[PDB]
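Regression test attached.
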Amino acid sequence: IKKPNNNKILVPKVSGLQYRVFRIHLPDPNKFGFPDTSFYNPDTQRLV
Amino acid sequence: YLPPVPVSKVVSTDEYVARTNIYYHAGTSRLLAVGHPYFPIKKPNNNKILVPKVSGLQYRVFRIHLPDPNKFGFPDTSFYNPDTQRLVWACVGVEVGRGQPLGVGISGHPLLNKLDDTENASAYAANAGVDNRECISMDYKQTQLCLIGCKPPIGEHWGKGSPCTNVAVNPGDCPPLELINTVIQDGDMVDTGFGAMDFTTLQANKSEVPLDICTSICKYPDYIKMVSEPYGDSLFFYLRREQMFVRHLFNRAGAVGENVPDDLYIKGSGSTANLASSNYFPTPSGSMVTSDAQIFNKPYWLQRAQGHNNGICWGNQLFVTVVDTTRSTNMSLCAAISTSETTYKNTNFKEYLRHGEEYDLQFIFQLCKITLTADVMTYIHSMNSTILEDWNFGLQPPPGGTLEDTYRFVTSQAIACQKHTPPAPKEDPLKKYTFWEVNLKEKFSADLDQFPLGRKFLLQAGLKAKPKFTLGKR
Amino acid sequence: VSKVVSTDEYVARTNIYYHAGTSRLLAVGHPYFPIKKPNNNKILVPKVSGLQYRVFRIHLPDPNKFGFPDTSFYNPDTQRLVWACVGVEVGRGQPLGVGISGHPLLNKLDDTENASAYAANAGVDNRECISMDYKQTQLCLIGCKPPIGEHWGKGSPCTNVAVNPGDCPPLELINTVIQDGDMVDTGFGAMDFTTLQANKSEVPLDICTSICKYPDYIKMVSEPYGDSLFFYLRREQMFVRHLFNRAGAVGENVPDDLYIKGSGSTANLASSNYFPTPSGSMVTSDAQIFNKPYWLQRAQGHNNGICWGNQLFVTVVDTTRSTNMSLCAAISTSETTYKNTNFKEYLRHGEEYDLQFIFQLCKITLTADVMTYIHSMNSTILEDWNFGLQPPPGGTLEDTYRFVTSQAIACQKHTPPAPKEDPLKKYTFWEVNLKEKFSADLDQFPLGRKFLLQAGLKAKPKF
Amino acid sequence: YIHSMNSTILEDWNFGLQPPPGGTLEDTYRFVTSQAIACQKHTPPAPK
């Protein structure tokens, strides 16, 4: 749905027939704080 | 239980806090500000602001935050269960960079209340006509100062009071005055040395002061009051420099509010039967600036402070405000409306007034923990209950049952948006106030040597563990 | 935030088991609408159909009042006793058959499945008498907190654009407690037609006024203690049948670029709106979820079958028995020539439920954490127990007697206000009392011995 | 092997120039705006 003169959408077109993509970010675990992190070195390695 | 009670032992922070062994740096480079010194520009019909009024005469607040102490990464954390111990950042050291060349600005008013110049006068004054007010500017008091703490700054200023009703309310009477303490907001006008008060309300003439200070309310911070904080958490440190001197000698022009009792002099005659305005006011003048006048651009180191707070940022929260008079020089330029004619036209060129601004934040930080006991924690409760919230204390009591919690679904919805467009739960108690913000939470580094400042921090206390590249001799 | 734990931590399981159960629950009523005296507001017949939801509230007497053959195994001071719900049954005796519903005026244009020519032009009030079958469904709900449903609904629009009559109202997602008598989805989705459908003819009678709702397993299971439901099962199915059109003024025209302009008969766009005809499928004896024992061991929530406040909930809904028997009475028995004027027609509907509940007995020790932890969870629970004190007051009172003696001492006693116990008293729904029916032996009951058989260890006297 | 697989991966780590030194060593961060006046910070395109 959009305003008849306008090009701007009034309502988004939605139906279950539409595909759905989901993008999910994670924060870099190499910035994180595990209750114990000493099990690794942040120099020679990283975490994924 | 033991100890958040009755007594007065007025806990000093550094006992319950423990200092970790690890440090960090983060920061933005810099910022800008430009603008017109005298007045802002908004769309004349609309309320939308095209250009603001900007000067070094504007106090600049600074508020930044750091993320959850319990979500953020350490090479060695073994020392804690975050449920056994809460955590906080600690502020060891701070730096104020200022990058623009140094020069003096100025401001004034096209109609200023003036009688005449009695600095040197060979003759008695004249009679006042209709609007003798003049166009004059003045050099503002040379100043630098610094304010940093975990709680917002507090200034003080005069304001018109509410006179007890005995004597009449009669117009022309002297309005009442009283002291006013208030939170300092960004964009406020720095007092020129004319006193912290409201020129708008208290001075009806409105021509008494230059445009910059004409409308608004200048304030000055009360250290006493602030340092009177028995926590000290207002600000845990500061320094200032200010200097000024006299330039010219003036007089007010207007009706005499309260006349001089004649017993103070001998009755004149002719011109001397009349009495010239008894009201003098000086012309304040800023002085020479020196390369020493910069108090900035040098690393500060704060170990112990007046309050009990030692550099602790509560609610993940930190405050800064600074004043520079040294860069006050405003850049001016013109726009030629007619680009053709070769003969000068005063009408041809539209002048403009702008100013530069530049800052730096390079922040040391230290890490700290809290052994978690209502033995203390309730004193935190006692101290401030706002930290009861974002912190969950790993518990409400040592058993610590959850809230039968609120988890909401709002994340995206049906075009309703009173599920908030309006403000969300909690609050900023300062939200009504207006002042500056930046997010630094992306700027941390697990290694120090990366940056210019830190090695001074290093070279300051030196280095125990000294980074080795196994390069050079083996 | 110190994070709720598994109830099987502090609770201890006892060695004793009990049973009680109702005689039965049957029903009679009219499926389509309730019956009332025409002038009066009082109901002559309550509206009843299988499509109506059913809620079951079951009290238990406080076991700490219930003397055991040997009571010595616990201290009533330091502890309490709480019932645990091991296993559950749902009896259904009706012969299995499908009901049905319709409406005499149904918004419709024409048949869209096959059209040999373009339709006619919309007149005034083309609604028709048409009926359909609702989706087949079976589900079961068990827990100590009321079942939480959800539905669509009208919310307050933004205030920017002025709403003209006939505008699209915004939509809202709304939870509420589930009330008995409420209606299953027909495949029209949970919402209030009454608000969002002015036509009132867009659906068959039964659901027209009410608000169909549906359980949201997420938010339900989202509970930290799971006490909404610790267990459930569900079965449902549907398929398409007919394809129709809404008949009425087009709310929003289709952008032309999505088609090519016609002419003549093709100049006018036929109604864009379609709605499906939902159709129940073949029922089977197999997929019946009832008349079979259940055995609870684990529950998604940390609550394991613990019924707080002597309180236990059952929500059961099925369409399988929806059969509506039709009957006819004769106003005049004389004439042998039949006349449709001679017979009045009536609709009544049967329902049949049954309940049999195992229960396990359970004790709780104390300490402070537990006390706290419960008092954290729901403090009202301790109220019905005897722990929480709460010192009593009182100094002095002046009785002045006597008052009807009309020499005036002040006017008087104002303190009824707290018989109030059920906070949900606003919520009406089906009620049953078991408190009398406990017994100490499974053996005498049909259901129980299975409990024995399952866990084995047939212990009985000698003869 | 990783750099073979997808090299852009190393970029987001601290990682990104050949055995361990560091850095993309031209100048990094800049911000020109505070209030609405003239060319906004978004007059240049978003580089990342």
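Expected vs. actual: identical. Chain C is about 10% helix and 30% strand.
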